[PDB]
Design a protein around this ligand. Sequence first.
Ligand SMILES: [Zn+2]
Length: 609
Amino acid sequence: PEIVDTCSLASPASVCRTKHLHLRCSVDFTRRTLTGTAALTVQSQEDNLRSLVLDTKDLTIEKVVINGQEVKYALGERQSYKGSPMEISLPIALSKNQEIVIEISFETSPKSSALQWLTPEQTSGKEHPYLFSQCQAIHCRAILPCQDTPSVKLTYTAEVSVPKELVALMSAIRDGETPDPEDPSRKIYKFIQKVPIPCYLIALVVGALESRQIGPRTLVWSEKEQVEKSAYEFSETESMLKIAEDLGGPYVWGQYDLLVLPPSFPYGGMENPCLTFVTPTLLAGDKSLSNVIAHEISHSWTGNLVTNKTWDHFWLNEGHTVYLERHICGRLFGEKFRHFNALGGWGELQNSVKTFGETHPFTKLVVDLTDIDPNVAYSSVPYEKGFALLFYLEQLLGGPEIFLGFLKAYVEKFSYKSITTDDWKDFLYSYFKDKVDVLNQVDWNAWLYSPGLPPIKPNYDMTLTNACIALSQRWITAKEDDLNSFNATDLKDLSSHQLNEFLAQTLQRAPLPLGHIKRMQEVYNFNAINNSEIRFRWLRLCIQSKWEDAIPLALKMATEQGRMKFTRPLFKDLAAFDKSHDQAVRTYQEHKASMHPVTAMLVGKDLKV
Ligand SMILES: [Zn+2]
């Protein structure tokens, strides 16, 4: 049979497809285990199907029951990061389209790569522990046995037993709570996901969670320490959803809840269906970062509804998501702003290609992950090279309203399906058959299969960017004789996004003489800004130019939150600044117990402890 996805060891979708999962499990914080049963409804695509294979990783299997009787099963040899295949002998031979229910009793490993267990000290509230999953790309197989490939999409229902003081949430619609009948110290939370999803979008959180309703289809959830601030910061979520619906078609998932993770959370957002994960570093206080969740909102069409069939084609997901997201922001702030964000994106692609090297296989849009762990293959290239291809095509084919018609038709065509780059390109050619002569001038080989920068750069409106450049080239090429020439007015017409962009361009040419940065503080007072993006780049600029006043401010930001994007480079700068190195090592030791274990480990490695 045709093998779809080489990152999966399970029977491929051409042989059988999982249609539904019923998960009944219990979360044990003492053992750091999930225990229970996974009932998979599986549909055969062949005749005479007598066995099938599932992905697993570090699972303990107690038994497999089919039609009331335990069945034989065998775990195969482990294949590195893919885990161990689990072969199940069926009690009957299945015919094409025939279905069977397979109930696997399992327990996860405390070292499960999919499950992040936090100690009380690593939470906001400091009393209760906390659990969150992170299945993308191929970690769902370390939670339960499955066809762990986005080429298969299933619905699911779940029942999750947790200590009664805690709350469970999942990538699904909440479906009620009851006391656990087998244990009065525990509650059972139920969930239902009626839209078929790839299993990497199965997600679970258990913790001391509270909610605020902020829209007809939106609750925000967090620990009590963050929930009120979060309800304000993200109060415009519903208006963003309505904009996304206008751009991409109906939102099919029912609810759109938000979860603001604990400060120790080392990552960015995650587009879990019905429950977007939000990093708390977006809590700027002025909503200047609230539009960032337009990324996860957009995945509800591009990635979650139309999905990449394998991880080689992940750019189809991220690329179309960034394209939709930049349209949401264009609706909110204007077309000039969409071009501002697009041009910044091109800059990030330049940096990514330079970091990897322009011949590196990961700077291709379509990547071959045959012998590469997809869990460690993420970069900005699918995001920004994919966006650039779509923005180039938009300009080639008659502009944004016309290409937005293509986007809507593409979503409608492939909703609830999983597709490859060739499926996408075939549909592009079909939709734009009236313009094939134009499409045939595109260097598809270069764009899709070649490393490095794209062969053509799109046309970017420069209005909002030129402002930041103008001021950037003024500070750098200045002497002590000119520092008095700066004043607050220099920032009068610059948005928070433009402030961020100015600091980005200024940091890129660090160090600045101390007189300049001292002046820059005197007139601009960047010490006062709380926007995590702005505060980050500013503090790096101060340390990399050896200002004493900045040492305590950077140490504070580096330990108050654990997002790797900020915490790691800050400790790197503080370690590299000889004046602060000793203090940076000492502060790390004092706070490392409250960090996420992976942040604690990598900063320790950087600090050479
Ligand atoms: Zn994304």
